């Protein structure tokens, strides 16, 4: 294998045509081939004007952006684009796809959180931004316009969902929207505070305590974030932290040149899939989840090598390890995926 060249993108804020133009011009002038694209959020995946109610942007600035052109098939994403949610989202769409999903051709949402595999890499995504008051709130479903202010705040439960994922092998890349709290102090923060003197106020507390815990636990080779509209680099132990800007502005896109360990299509990660199935009982009520009367970490402690093997066989049987486009509406996708999770969990016959 020669190498894979991965585009990493900060905030999109609805500017898809422009992003893809810049990516194409990069290929043209470098002769390099982009394998795939990863975006750190503000994806604004509004299908139609009805979704505007779920986008938290001041009314004077609120627009559709470009997404609907891709949803309708008038434009077509030229690269496989993997993304997480930020603070400017069609949040209803994302909640229907909380277990991940393609929003249109070549655009795959990682859900609230998940790990995926592509070309031998394991990639973790953590959606939203941090708000302390909401970190223990459940999601209520179906979405309603009242929830526009809260749907995009990162829940604490993602830490328990994700923390065992580096036990069998290291995570190559983790993605979040807001920065891991404290990582500002591990780069050229002085230089940063000249460009952005508003950040000085926050000092070491700038960013998400949830993304901090995850970074600490998984210690990925790379952690990528956006949201702040500036470039930044920091080293935290074995983790290279990279923060990226916003499309239309400088340093919105960068590129990772990584070994091509294997060439494989996009797949569900086996460890993640075991975690997803083993936590079904906390996610049993479609109208309100998770149910924190259950303990997620208690649910996960029941995993064994032998039982994980069974989970994967059933997942392979009903869903398949390859992540593939689904043309059902997102509400139907919510039902279908949760149907198979539940069915697989129940076949395990766990006491
Ligand atoms: Mn943002
Ligand atoms: Zn942004």
UniProtKB/Swiss-Prot annotation:
GO terms for biological process: mRNA splicing, via spliceosome; RNA splicing, via transesterification reactions. The keyword Metal-binding applies. Its EC number is 3.1.4.-. A divalent metal cation 1 binds at residues 11, 13, 229. Residues 127-155 are annotated as: Lariat recognition loop. Keywords: Cytoplasm, Hydrolase, Iron, Manganese, Metal-binding, mRNA processing, RNA-binding, Zinc. One of its GO terms (cellular component) is nucleus. RNA binds at residues 56, 87-88, 131, 153, 198, 202, 227-229. Binds 2 divalent metal cations per subunit. A divalent metal cation 2 binds at residues 42, 87, 177, 227. InterPro entries: Calcineurin-like_PHP_ApaH, Dbr1_CTD, Dbr1_N, Metallo-depent_PP-like. It is found in: Cytoplasm, Perinuclear region. It comes from the Eukaryota. It is an enzyme of class 3 (hydrolase). Active in presence of diverse metals including Fe(2+), Zn(2+) and Mn(2+). Binds two metal cations in two adjacent alpha and beta metal-binding pockets. The activity is the highest with Fe(2+) bound to the 2 metal-binding sites. The activity is slightly lower with Fe(2+) bound to the beta site and Zn(2+) to the alpha site and decreases further when only Zn(2+) is bound. No activity with Mn(2+). However, another study showed activity with Mn(2+) bound to the beta site and Zn(2+) to the alpha site. Mn(2+) appears unable to bind to the alpha site. Changing residue 11 to A: Fails to complement a DBR1-deficient yeast mutant resulting in the accumulation of lariat intron. Disulfide bonds: none annotated. Its cofactor is Fe(2+); Zn(2+); Mn(2+). One of its GO terms (molecular function) is manganese ion binding. Changing residue 11 to S: Loss of RNA debranching activity. Fails to complement a DBR1-deficient yeast mutant resulting in the accumulation of lariat intron. Belongs to the lariat debranching enzyme family. Cleaves the 2'-5' phosphodiester linkage at the branch point of excised lariat intron RNA and converts them into linear molecules that can be subsequently degraded, thereby facilitating ribonucleotide turnover. This is Lariat debranching enzyme. It comes from Entamoeba histolytica (strain ATCC 30459 / HM-1:IMSS / ABRM).
């Amino acid at each position: 294998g020669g190498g894979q060249h991965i585009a990493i993108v900060g905030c999109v804020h609805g500017k898809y045509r422009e992003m893809y133009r810049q990516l194409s011009e990069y290929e043209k002038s470098t002769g390099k081939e982009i394998s795939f694209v990863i975006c750190t959020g503000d994806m604004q995946t509004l299908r139609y004007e009805a979704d505007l109610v779920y986008l938290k942007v001041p009314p004077k600035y609120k627009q559709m952006g470009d997404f609907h052109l891709y949803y309708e098939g008038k434009e077509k994403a030229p690269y496989l684009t993997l993304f997480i949610g930020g603070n400017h989202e069609s949040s209803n769409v994302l909640l229907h796809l909380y277990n991940g999903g393609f929003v249109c051709f070549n655009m795959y949402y990682l859900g609230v959180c998940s790990c995926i595999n592509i070309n031998g890499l394991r990639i973790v995504g953590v959606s939203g931004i941090y708000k302390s008051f909401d970190e223990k709130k459940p999601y209520t479903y179906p979405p309603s316009p009242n929830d526009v202010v809260s749907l995009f705040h990162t829940r604490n439960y993602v830490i328990q969902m994700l923390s065992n994922l580096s036990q069998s092998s290291q995570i190559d890349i983790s993605l979040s929207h807001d920065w891991p709290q404290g990582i500002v102090m591990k780069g050229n923060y002085k230089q940063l505070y000249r460009f952005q003197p508003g950040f000085k106020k926050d000092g070491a507390s700038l960013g998400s305590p949830i993304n901090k815990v995850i970074l600490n636990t998984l210690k990925p080779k790379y952690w990528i974030s956006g949201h702040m509209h500036c470039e930044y680099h920091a080293e935290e132990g074995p983790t290279h932290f990279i923060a990226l800007g916003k499309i239309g502005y400088k340093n919105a896109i960068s590129y990772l040149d990584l070994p091509l360990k294997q060439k494989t299509d996009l797949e569900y990660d086996k460890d993640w899939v075991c975690n997803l199935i083993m936590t079904w009982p906390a996610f049993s009520n479609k109208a309100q989840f998770p149910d924190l009367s259950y303990s997620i970490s208690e649910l996960l402690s029941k995993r064994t090598k032998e039982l994980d093997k069974k989970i994967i066989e059933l997942w392979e049987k009903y869903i398949g390890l390859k992540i593939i486009y689904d043309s059902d509406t997102f509400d139907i996708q919510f039902t279908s995926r949760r149907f198979y999770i539940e069915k697989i969990y129940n076949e395990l016959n766990i006491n």
